[PDB]
Symmetry: D2
Subunit: 322 residues, 4 copies
């Protein structure tokens, strides 16, 4: 008899399926930071990694497996073939190649393959331009709107709260503030909702977020955009902050928490938007993905900025060939 058979008596060999499986597509700095953060948060019983660069993919999988002793995710798998992703509860897309067209072409291959092996999964899109690519994943997959989630303004809001926390000398967890709309350069800081312990900063300081503000709090949102380009300039890419923010969304979904996050969802029917566009609003996240969304009261200016983003996104999206 083998040493294994001498040591262990088997009761049954019955075929089993993962109960809390997560797949990460694209093993670049973003995908790998998502992976390590998900692993250290014990959110999955199985992690699958997919990429087109086979050697890097194998190396990344092996490196994570070598740290198994320090984790509570018993199975880590990888492959170019999507059969490794079968029965995933959540599929995170961090894969990426004007730039719009080549990322749409990457999705044309990825999304049907994801849908084939995990037809009941929630899709979480991180790849940029995130608002266009969440629409692209929704269009290709044929999934209901609740199961197609864009990372959207989750990171923008996290950076905003970090900067707010630094100015006030308070932990970001206790500094509330929402950055909504189009992810990136065109995002909207909702000044009316910025508060500490339910105390509105705008009520205390009516000049908040205006050019007349002597303390120039508008700079806090300007620094959210500036910080992102600064990190790229300094280290060539960003990874840690996005990975942590994605694992926070993954936690709400995997644990059915029904916490509210600023993520990209199909906004048709709000703020005079009549087109099939995805923009960030506060969404309730759980086991069914986006089950509900918060209807934020926006000022005329804020509403106009979301409508302008929606018009620009639809302008690009109506010319898209699938």
């Amino acid at each position: 008899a083998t040493l294994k058979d001498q040591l262990i008596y088997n009761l049954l060999k019955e075929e089993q399926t993962p109960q809390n499986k997560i797949t990460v597509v694209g093993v670049g700095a973003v995908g790998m930071a998502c992976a390590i953060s998900i692993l250290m948060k014990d959110l999955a019983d199985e992690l699958a990694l997919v990429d087109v660069i086979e050697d890097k993919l194998k190396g990344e999988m092996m490196d994570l497996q070598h740290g198994s002793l320090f984790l509570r995710t018993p199975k880590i798998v990888s492959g170019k073939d999507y059969n490794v992703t079968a029965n995933s509860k959540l599929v995170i897309i961090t894969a990426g190649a004007n730039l719009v067209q080549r990322n749409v072409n990457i999705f044309k291959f990825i999304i049907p393959n994801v849908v084939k092996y995990s037809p009941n999964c929630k899709l979480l899109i991180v790849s940029n331009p995130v608002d266009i690519l969440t629409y692209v994943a929704w269009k290709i997959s044929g999934f209901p709107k609740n199961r197609v989630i864009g990372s959207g303004c989750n990171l923008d809001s996290a950076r905003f709260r970090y900067l707010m926390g630094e100015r006030l000398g308070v932990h970001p967890l206790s500094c509330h503030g929402w950055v909504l709309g189009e992810h990136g350069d065109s995002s909207v800081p909702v000044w009316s909702g910025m508060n500490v312990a339910g105390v509105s900063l705008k009520t205390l300081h009516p000049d908040l977020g205006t050019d007349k503000d002597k303390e120039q709090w508008k700079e806090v949102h300007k620094q959210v955009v500036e910080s992102a380009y600064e990190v790229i300039k300094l280290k060539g890419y960003t990874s840690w902050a996005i990975g942590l923010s994605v694992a926070d969304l993954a936690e709400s979904i995997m644990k059915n928490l029904r916490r509210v996050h600023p993520v990209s969802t199909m906004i048709k029917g709000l703020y005079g938007i009549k087109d099939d566009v995805f923009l960030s609003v506060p969404c309730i996240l759980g086991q069914n993905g986006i089950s509900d969304l918060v209807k934020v009261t926006l000022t005329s200016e804020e509403e106009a900025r979301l409508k302008k983003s929606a018009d620009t996104l639809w302008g690009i999206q109506k010319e898209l060939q699938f």
Copy 2:
């Protein structure tokens, strides 16, 4: 008054010393993996990062700070100057660069780092990750002037973790329940201690006396060979290794910061054991806590195992006695 003063009334300005500070020196793939793993394990109330590449260092610090909302480490700092590292409980060194020439280049790097670390955190524990780890732990010990308990080498911690992963894969059991120790010199010359390999206290060697020999039909020696083979394979495939070392270092940091007194295979002063008479650092199971290595486990080794550690000690001392401090 300012909006801050309108919103918040201050009771005291008194800002005390950080109580559970960790410093990571070198922000390459290894140091950053150590950093993220330490952050996600809530081991520090302050994290300091140091490197000579100023742009990369700032970018890495900012990227970690941007994830603050999702962490419980309220202060993340960085700088080329070691004043940012003041009052660290633990300092992790991952900085580094013919073989005697390569080691000498790391000695010259350590000649700059170690006095600067000692200046700002004289009571810290030093955790050496930089390769060749056994030699560089000796170098850090020699330069710092610290007692042996406060100078810890990552040593065979990763080698053992990989061994347990491979053992777990062969047996269909979680690595946490697969016990096995890889000791001695970190890397190619490490020693798998076959006598201690067990599941639930059941010795694999007692069940299978050929275990770890060339006459073994199942070739369990391949499990230790795969520990060394895997490391080169990861380098070939992605260019470096990061995740496994980062996780293993954070596991050591946890025992130290939380004074757990768990047993880990780390590099310590082995003079006085296995006929070793030279000032060399080799991995043995050590009890880790608030004062670093307080104790070590005296593993019963066979004549062959003892000879391999003695040969490693002789080779290490041969390189060490020629180094310029």
Copy 3:
């Protein structure tokens, strides 16, 4: 020689002291729920338990110690003598029993406890849970002689947590995303701050102007009424409350031990606010960290809310001025 000496070689026999010690005074249902929650959150390297009932105290300590394999707190100690509490960073008081006769009995208990706590941990933060919490936080502050930042009352922490649970149930949103503050005097006379009630920064009062009034067709005033009613209902149903308070106390302990600077509704010296001139403790949002309450949030209250806090401060002072120290 001994088996221990054959197995383990000792490097140093250095006497060490805990770096993150927490003491719980009173091992009743509340005290023990605080201890298990603190243990499962890895907040302490040492946990000390104190009580006057010696058999129950020993039994509780042993029961916790027997679960050590599943915890990361290496030392659990207990005793009637306060020498077991020496060098505590945080001391949690859950000890205690006409309503006025009751207060004086708790004052008598505190006259023994507080000097003993101060003697062995002069630099600790005191966290008062025992009822009437606002009066007993004042009593602990007066007896200890500690600055106001190091005397914290559990106050409206639990009231706010229950409010957020009830708000969450009505809206179908996790309590973490349902923001609402219950301030002032803990218990029956607490104040729900309707203006701050929000989800994602969207004011419920702006959306529903009748919120918190008798005109309200949805009767949101019942949410605050149910916070008070729930507490008496749990007592009626199981005889005491433990789990919710223990979890809420461990959340405060986390901000203090980890120097998080998160904002919590806790009882603090409110003299100088809302026209209050007496030495009384009431709940306001406080920034909690390594120095206890370093700062407080100045909540804009309506004239009605301000009047309720002033009436509570007058009533608390009325009881306080008659206490014998």
Copy 4:
């Protein structure tokens, strides 16, 4: 429109069948310690509590729900009716029943299980059953017989706590964390448990090899006292506080973690041992078992000395003696 409808736009009202649900039957000190430990370890997305004392059950549920802000288990439910337990992955039985007969107390607990087990099976036919109620070895057998479940899905807490206490005591003597002190207590849970001296080690270094007198009466250091103290400790906690709760709750949550997360870690739990150590009867005894999503998929075959083998066989004979007389 309601304030909720003004604030929130609903995408779908559809509620999925429970995905990672745990049920705790019996809300005494043991059940509630299991419940708080499971909650603080984020093992379940839904926790169900069942008991026959309706007021205490409601009070315990409400108390846990009031701490929701500090937890990541979004749904806590309770009831006397087992419809609240539907689709549980794992069902933990802690419900239990002045000097009566040995067979008398067992039959009282058997009567309770005759009501519980069919109700559990009705609403969660595919669950894993984890038995904590005493006498655990007999009651795991009873749950197995009544349920009709395959042996892999019926797990007894067994010697999990005995081993945890042993490792704590070993750790205290050696000045090492219990996580690094390895040692197995097997067989019959409680008074008749077997310390496996041959497997006692630190870093793979056998204590028995270093100290051949280990676990014998001639031992000058009396290491037998470490196992004697495991049994003595249990009675001492009962004498001092009236019951035990924290240690059992933590040990049960550790088993729940391996099952819910399919970890395949090895634990000393009670399993149907027929076919081992000359045991021919349908009895449950503790051996190291691999725990995962299908419950006990495998077991470790520990080499026992003649004396150790004899003690397990004597336990098996005693347990079968009681079981063959039980009225179902």
